[PDB]
């Protein structure tokens, strides 16, 4: 008949039908008597393909055959199972891999303590040295999961492995098997942050295809949508959008509005717009505009935000969108009455009405006609004049209003008209509303038309008196407005610059931040010099805020000083020393803005020019000596001096006539020679050895290094210095 060896030798061949070989050998099996002789024969020849780790296709064909055949005293599949479980600890990596592989394939093709021994054995192999063996074990144990039974030992291992396995495929393996349960869900969605692109891509598929939209909190849905949308690879973008978003959209019945309700549109609206824009670009306009029956007044925030994001979209699809845009929007003026009638309906806590209000106020820049401008400006003015309106909408209305006017003087006038209106009757929020207009006027105002004599009215009437206001919310906008004015006229800045400094030290903290912004924007625009010809100490003030207890002030001071340096407006090896120190200071570890800002500045500032590097070289010794002289109490004593010196040498390399590193070598040899047995002797020598020394400095340097070799007593530093000596001698 057909013997097992022929059957296997045949299955080895590429083009050889397997359905046939099953039938041929299958008879050979039943035709034999005492099946155990066949049983022992089957395993014997199966061994020839269990001892090969590499995926040669011949080997793979036999495995598939032996597995397919078997699953198409107790035996034969049970005989084979018994054999596999006894061999799963074999010293050969191949065997252990094949054993798990076969068990996996067996468990997958088939229609007693064997289930228990498998579950036990594969659970062991989850810890295999060889990654592939662990993978097969995961695939093997996949069918043997149980979500309902809490703390299953398969789902547990999966929970551990999916996050903790060194090997990406092992994780990617567990990610495709893991059953979406309550404890499991967080691990699965957590793989959308996996280092490997293939794991991240897959996490969105399993999420979209194995987990229900309900199982995920609203917060998680926004994290997934946002995260996947701006993920480093378009492979991951497309993966989330294809499987997850279009899947989440499908549960909505392919309706976008219903989907929005699920994304908590009020708070995370920016993300929602992104989702909208991504979704918009893949559906015809006839359908997107269809979601809107001219406006319908009783609406949800999901409805408002949709129409607003669609109108802005439709205006961007230039010509085609013109047709579909005119379908949903009424002519500019009739919209004004529509806008107005809504704002009136505002005195349980309907924040929701403020949000929806913004969305309609924001639709204004999708309208358009000279008559209509005046009647939009009309309602906008009316709304701004009306009390009871929340300040949240003020800024948005003012911006929409100022956009249209075109003329800086006409803006200042239309504004002046509005403030005088609000100033007639009689509290602090009426001052806030006004200053909000002043601010939004100053920031959009071009520098040319600086301080129109009408503005000086508002400056004298509203802006200046605002600074001494008893209400803190008033002062803040006052300062912000003053700084915007100072940017307009240099002489104006000069007069009130001293006032701005006053606000810096005396006033409330949140006002200070505004003050810093003001002062720094003015120093960046007019330089430091014109302000020392009243405040001779301006640089001292801003500097002492680096040692502030408030994060916003450290980061404000630090960044503002970094900006002044980068544009060559400030040269200070002191402040630069205080900056480098601030960046290494432990007190700053949770000041993300600060630490990140400087991290970019130091390098880009250093390599910009020699004078910049020279600034670092001048700061070298004072920095490390500030460190070495720090008492145990200060956070500075915590700092590592070697890290700082290496950074300074790094920033000062000529790979970015006596070079800067040549001057440094001098400074350092002069220092080493001053105190050769200093506690920092090790640091200075390392700095010395890592320098990029010019060729012509060698003879002069050699002279110094010899004397250093005489005075330095640390045997460690000496061996390094001798090593430097031989290099020079070359």
């Amino acid at each position: 008949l057909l013997s097992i060896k022929e059957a296997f030798r045949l299955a080895q061949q590429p083009h050889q039908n397997q359905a046939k070989l099953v039938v041929a050998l299958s008879r050979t099996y039943r035709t034999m008597d005492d099946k155990t002789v066949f049983h022992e024969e089957f395993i014997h020849y199966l061994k020839y393909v269990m001892v090969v780790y590499k995926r040669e296709p011949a080997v793979e064909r036999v495995i598939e055959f032996a597995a397919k055949f078997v699953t198409s005293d107790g035996g034969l599949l049970n005989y084979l199972f018994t054999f596999l479980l006894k061999s799963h600890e074999a010293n050969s990596n191949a065997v252990r891999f094949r054993v798990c592989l076969l068990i996996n394939k067996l468990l997958g093709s088939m229609p007693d303590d064997v289930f228990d021994k498998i579950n036990k054995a594969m659970l062991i192999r989850l810890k295999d040295k060889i990654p592939n063996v662990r993978i097969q074990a995961v695939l093997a144990l996949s069918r043997l999961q149980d979500p309902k039974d809490d703390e299953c030992p398969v789902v547990n291992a999966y929970a551990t492995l999916i996050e903790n396995d060194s090997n990406p495929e092992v994780r990617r393996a567990v990610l495709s098997c893991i059953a979406p349960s309550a404890k499991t869900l967080p691990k699965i969605v957590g793989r959308t942050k996996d280092v490997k692109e293939a794991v991240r891509k897959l996490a969105y598929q399993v999420l979209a295809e194995k987990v229900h939209m309900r199982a995920m909190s609203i917060a998680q849905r926004v994290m997934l949508l946002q995260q996947g949308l701006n993920d480093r690879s378009d492979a991951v973008k497309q993966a989330m959008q294809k499987h997850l978003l279009q899947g989440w959209l499908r549960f909505s019945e392919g309706n976008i509005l219903e989907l929005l309700h699920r994304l908590d549109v009020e708070n995370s609206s920016e993300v929602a717009v992104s989702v909208l824009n991504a979704l918009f670009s893949i559906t015809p306009l006839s359908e997107l505009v269809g979601l809107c029956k001219i406006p319908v007044e009783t609406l949800t925030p999901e409805i408002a935000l949709y129409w607003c994001a669609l109108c802005e979209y439709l205006k961007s699809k230039g010509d085609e969108g013109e047709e579909f845009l005119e379908q949903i929007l009424p002519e500019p003026v009739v919209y004004a009455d529509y806008l107005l009638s809504y704002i009136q309906s505002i005195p349980g806590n309907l924040m929701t009405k403020e949000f929806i209000g913004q969305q309609l106020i924001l639709i204004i820049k999708s309208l358009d006609e000279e008559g209509g401008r005046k009647k939009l400006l009309a309602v906008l003015q009316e709304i701004l004049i009306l009390p009871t309106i929340p300040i949240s909408l003020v800024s948005f209305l003012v911006e929409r209003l100022l956009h249209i006017i075109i003329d800086d003087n006409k803006r200042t006038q239309i504004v002046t008209e509005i403030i005088s209106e609000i100033r007639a009757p009689i509290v602090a929020e009426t001052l806030q509303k006004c200053l909000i207009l002043c601010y939004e006027l100053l920031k959009q105002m071009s520098i040319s038309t600086g301080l129109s004599a009408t503005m000086n009215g508002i400056i004298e009437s509203l802006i200046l008196p605002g600074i001494i206001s008893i209400h803190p919310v008033v002062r803040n906008l006052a300062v912000l407005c003053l700084g915007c004015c100072g940017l307009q006229n240099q002489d104006f800045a000069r007069k009130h610059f001293v006032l701005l400094l006053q606000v810096l030290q005396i006033d409330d903290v949140t006002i200070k931040i505004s003050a810093l912004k003001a002062i720094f924007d003015q120093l960046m625009t007019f330089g430091i010099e014109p302000f020392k010809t009243t405040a001779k100490n301006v640089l001292k003030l801003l500097s002492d805020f680096l040692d502030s207890e408030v994060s916003e002030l450290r980061t404000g001071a630090a960044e503002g000083l970094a900006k002044l340096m980068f544009s060559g407006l400030l040269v200070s090896s002191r402040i630069l020393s205080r900056l480098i120190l601030l960046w290494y200071n432990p007190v700053t570890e949770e000041d993300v803005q600060l630490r990140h800002c400087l991290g970019v500045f130091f390098p880009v500032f250093a390599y910009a020019s020699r004078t910049n590097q020279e600034c670092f070289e001048e700061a070298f010794l004072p920095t490390l000596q500030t460190l070495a002289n720090a008492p145990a109490s200060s956070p500075l004593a915590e700092i590592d001096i070697t890290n700082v010196a290496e950074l300074l040498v790094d920033l000062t390399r000529p790979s970015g006539a006596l070079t800067v590193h040549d001057n440094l070598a001098m400074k350092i040899c002069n220092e080493i020679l001053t105190s050769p047995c200093s506690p920092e002797i090790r640091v200075y020598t390392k700095a010395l050895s890592s320098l990029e020394l010019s060729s012509h400095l060698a003879k002069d340097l050699l002279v110094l290094l010899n004397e250093i070799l005489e005075q330095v007593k640390d045997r460690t530093c000496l061996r390094a210095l001798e090593k430097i000596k031989i290099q020079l001698e070359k």
Partner: protein, 50 residues
């Protein structure tokens, strides 16, 4: 190509020794997961009020 003919003593392969699984000591998600800030050098030349 697999030669099923020659009687190979497969004991060398299936035999037990030491030691199969990775050691008890052996890691965190820090290695597998990406760290979530962006500072453009252009913000260094930009104003706060505009």
């Amino acid at each position: 190509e697999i030669d099923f003919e020659d009687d190979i003593d497969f004991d060398v392969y299936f035999r037990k020794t030491k030691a199969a699984t990775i050691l008890t000591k052996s890691q965190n998600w820090r290695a597998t997961t990406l760290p979530t800030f962006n500072y453009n050098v252009d913000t260094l030349v930009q104003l706060h009020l505009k």
